[PDB]
C-alpha cells in the first residue's frame, strides 16, 4: 500500500539529484551525520552554477553562430566574467584556448 | 556489459535544455561540466566539513552548506546561490 514514489529532486523543484548528492555526502567522509536539507541546498547551488555557466556558454556559441557548446565557449564564458574567473582562477579548461589580448604597446603606431 | 559509471551528464543536459532550449553540447564540454560539478561539490562539502569540525558538530546541515557557499563563492554569485538554496530547501520542507 506504499504511496507512489516521488523524488526529492521533484519535491525541491530541482533537476540535479538530491538522492545522489545525499549518498555522496554520506560516503564522502565529511561528517558522521548529514541533515535532510543539506543535499537539497547543495543540489540547488550546483544547479544554479551549472545553469549560469551553460547560459553564458550558449550565448557565446550563439555569438559564434554555433548551435553546440564547445570547450572554447565554456572558456570564453568563464574568463569574460570576473566572478566566475575568480571562482575558477586556478582551473585549466582543456581545449579552451585563451582570450584574445594583445598589449597596447605591441600594436603598430 | 560493464560496471555502471554514474555521471552528471543527464542533469547537465536537462539544465541546458531549460536555459537554452535549442542548443546542444559536445562530449568534451559535457566532460568539462562534469569536472566542474565534481570540483564545486568537493569544495563545498570540504568547507562544510571543516565548519562542523570547528564547531564540534557531528551533523552537516543546510546552515553549514550556506556558510560554505558564502565563504567559497564571490559576491553576487554567492548571494544568488544562497537564494536558490534557500528557496529549494523551503519548497522541499513544504513537500
Amino acid at each position: 500500500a506504499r504511496a507512489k514514489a516521488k523524488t526529492r529532486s521533484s519535491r525541491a523543484g530541482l533537476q540535479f539529484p538530491v538522492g545522489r548528492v545525499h549518498r555522496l555526502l554520506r560516503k564522502g567522509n565529511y561528517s558522521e551525520r548529514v541533515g535532510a536539507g543539506a543535499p537539497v541546498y547543495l543540489a540547488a547551488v550546483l544547479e544554479y552554477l551549472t545553469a549560469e555557466i551553460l547560459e553564458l556558454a550558449g550565448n557565446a556559441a550563439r555569438d559564434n553562430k554555433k548551435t553546440r557548446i564547445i570547450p572554447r565557449h565554456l572558456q570564453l564564458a568563464i574568463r569574460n566574467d570576473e566572478e566566475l574567473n575568480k571562482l575558477l582562477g586556478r582551473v585549466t579548461i582543456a581545449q579552451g584556448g585563451v582570450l584574445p589580448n594583445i598589449q597596447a604597446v605591441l600594436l603598430p603606431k | 556489459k560493464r560496471s555502471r559509471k554514474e555521471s552528471y551528464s543527464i542533469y547537465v543536459y536537462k539544465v541546458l535544455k531549460q536555459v537554452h532550449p535549442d542548443t546542444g553540447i559536445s562530449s568534451k564540454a559535457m566532460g568539462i561540466m562534469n569536472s566542474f560539478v565534481n570540483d564545486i561539490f568537493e569544495r563545498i562539502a570540504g568547507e562544510a566539513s571543516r565548519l562542523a569540525h570547528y564547531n564540534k558538530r557531528s551533523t552537516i546541515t543546510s546552515r553549514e552548506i550556506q556558510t560554505a557557499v558564502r565563504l567559497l563563492l564571490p559576491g553576487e554569485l554567492a548571494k544568488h546561490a544562497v537564494s536558490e538554496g534557500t528557496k529549494a530547501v523551503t519548497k522541499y520542507t513544504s513537500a
Epitope: 566574467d81 566572478e83 | 559576491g75 553576487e76
Partner: single-chain antibody
Framework: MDIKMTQSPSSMHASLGERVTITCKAS??????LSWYQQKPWKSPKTLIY???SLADGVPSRFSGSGSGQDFSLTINNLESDDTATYYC?????????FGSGTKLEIKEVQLQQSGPELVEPGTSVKMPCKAS????????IQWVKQTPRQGLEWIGY????????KYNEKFKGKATLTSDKSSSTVYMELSSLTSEDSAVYYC?????????????WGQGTSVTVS
C-alpha cells in the same frame, strides 16, 4: 524584433490601505528576467523586484511580483503615502533591454555620483562622468539609461570595467560612446552630433554581470538640455 513591454494600466487612482495590481505583458518570451522600478518625480528610480519575484534589498514585503514567460504582475498591499510614483517594468532577457510605458499610481554604501545639468548648442559633444564608490568597481557593469517625457526610458548600453567590454542599443550606435577609468573608478559617456532630440536626463545604473541581477543602484541623473 525588439521585445516591446506592454503595461496594461497607464494610470491608477486608489485609496489608502487597499490593494493595487499592475500587469505587464511581454511581446516575446523573456524567460523570467523582469524587474520593477519605482520612480518618484524628479528623483532617480529605485528597484523593487528582480527576477520577477524577488524583493530588492531594503524593499518592504508589501511589494510583490509574479508571472513568467510573457505575462507578469506587480502587487502593492498596504498603500502608504510614499507609494505614489511611476512604476516601470524592465526586461533584460534579450540584448536590447526594454522598459515599460510606466504606470502612474496616485493615492488619496554603493554610491554613484553623476554630473549636474548641461546646456549645449546642437552639433557639439558632451561627456557625462560616472564616479562609482562603495563597492569593487570592476565586478559590476555600468548601464546607461535615457529618460524622455515623450519616449520614456530607454536602455542605451553598458560598460564592463573588468574587460572594457561594450554593448549598445542600435538606436545609439555612434551617438553614444562609453569609456571607463579603473584608476579613478569613473565611467564616461560621450555623445556625438548633439540634437534637440537629445534633451533628456541620463542615468548611470549599476548591474552585476549575473544574468538575474538587475539595475540595482542608480545615479542622480544628468539633465542635458540642447538649445
Amino acid at each position: 524584433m525588439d521585445i516591446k513591454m506592454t503595461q496594461s494600466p497607464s494610470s491608477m487612482h486608489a485609496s489608502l490601505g487597499e490593494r493595487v495590481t499592475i500587469t505587464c505583458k511581454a511581446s516575446q518570451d523573456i524567460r523570467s528576467y523582469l524587474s520593477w522600478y519605482q520612480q518618484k518625480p524628479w528623483k532617480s528610480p529605485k528597484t523593487l523586484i528582480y527576477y520577477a519575484t524577488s524583493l530588492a534589498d531594503g524593499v518592504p514585503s508589501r511589494f510583490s511580483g509574479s508571472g513568467s514567460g510573457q505575462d507578469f504582475s506587480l502587487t502593492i498591499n498596504n498603500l502608504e503615502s510614499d507609494d505614489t510614483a511611476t512604476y516601470y517594468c524592465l526586461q533584460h532577457g534579450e540584448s536590447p533591454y526594454t522598459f515599460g510605458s510606466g504606470t502612474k499610481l496616485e493615492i488619496k554604501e554603493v554610491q554613484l555620483q553623476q554630473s549636474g545639468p548641461e546646456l549645449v548648442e546642437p552639433g557639439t559633444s558632451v561627456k557625462m562622468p560616472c564616479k562609482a564608490s562603495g563597492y569593487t568597481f570592476t565586478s559590476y557593469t555600468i548601464q546607461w539609461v535615457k529618460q524622455t517625457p515623450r519616449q520614456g526610458l530607454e536602455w542605451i548600453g553598458y560598460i564592463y570595467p573588468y574587460n572594457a567590454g561594450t554593448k549598445y542599443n542600435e538606436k545609439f550606435k555612434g551617438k553614444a560612446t562609453l569609456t571607463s577609468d579603473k584608476s579613478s573608478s569613473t565611467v564616461y559617456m560621450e555623445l556625438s552630433s548633439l540634437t534637440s532630440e537629445d534633451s533628456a536626463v541620463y542615468y548611470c545604473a549599476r548591474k552585476s554581470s549575473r544574468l538575474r541581477s538587475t539595475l540595482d543602484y542608480w545615479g542622480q541623473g544628468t539633465s542635458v538640455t540642447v538649445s
